[PDB]
Point group: C4
Chain length 106, copies 4
């Protein structure tokens, strides 16, 4: 170990954001839960340990999805997490798209 | 500061989000890639090429011009992703940039 | 082999099938990942193209566990001197399977 | 002013296109030799936009061979001074074709 990474995954719609990473501190999660709506919360779950936020009453179009990704990337960069890679898929039957963002420590 | 550029085809619709994006950078891209129009909430620049059709090769050329234009302005490419929507027949690609500072 | 070797790790779901390509991938790295991935079974070697393959036949990874699998692979490989450079993913509507690729370069 | 390169690969049959004004023909020839070796043909030049295109009409690549093609391209380019920065991919359900893009920078 000693090489911590972070994965943020975002599925739409409705928006469901998950954050995974062994060195991810709750204080980082709390900073992002204030940025993303700009009083919805991230809930913690184990195996694998992660934080999950669902915006049940929200619908994001392409522009607002771009804004969500940007706020996450900017918030995490300020916390010492650098963006290294991303990927995305769209599921034709559910009509949902999922995007993953991978970060490394500097 | 970071920047997200999103490009949907077809017709081409290019959106650029990032508070630190200069209007001078936007103008350089306009000449490289009709104009980008500014809109608030969220603050962004949007260019729509209604009378244009870009095939796979021209989509690659559009991405390259955007990346090269932004690199010269101090924005480094960090990641990308893409999806194709089977019902609309449209594909959307995102390009993420970070400042070299 | 002018300037530094590379790796490609591909993962298809479901069931999870992980493939690792790259001539410079040492068997010691493959063993470390074998211990890591279930925590988040062995890799078998096949030629033409040379690669390591692991199947988890009795497993069904939801989206969260897919993210955990990618993270364990990235972290394991980073500790071994392999830096993540890019990723991509597709979903096949007819098979219902998604495939994600992770590309690494030497430090 | 900074040169970048985009390599796009569509399957099946495999069609590889390379765009980037600063791409040397020596680099094109190197990849021309590497790509068939990864799966075991030439790249043709076309204008508007200027690019190199290779076909393998008599070939059908499974997911493993697609990974091998991407890896050979990345490794070949890295030796030529091109660093991998990003990738993306889509699958078209009606044509049954998948397209992957690989972006490289000289820096
Ligand atoms: Cl992607
Ligand atoms: Cl990427
Ligand atoms: Cl897709
Ligand atoms: Mg994709
Ligand atoms: Mg990507
Ligand atoms: Na990258």
């Amino acid at each position: 170990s000693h090489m911590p990474n972070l994965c943020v995954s975002a599925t739409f719609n409705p928006p469901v954001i998950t954050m995974l990473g062994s060195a991810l501190r709750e204080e980082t999660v709390k900073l992002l839960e204030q940025r993303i709506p700009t009083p919805v919360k991230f809930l913690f779950y184990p195996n694998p340990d992660h934080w999950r936020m669902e915006l049940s009453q929200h619908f994001c179009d392409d522009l607002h999805k771009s804004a969500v990704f940007l706020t996450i990337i900017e918030g995490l960069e300020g916390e010492g997490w650098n963006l290294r890679a991303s990927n995305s898929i769209r599921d034709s039957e559910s009509g949902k798209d999922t995007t993953k963002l991978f970060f490394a420590r500097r």
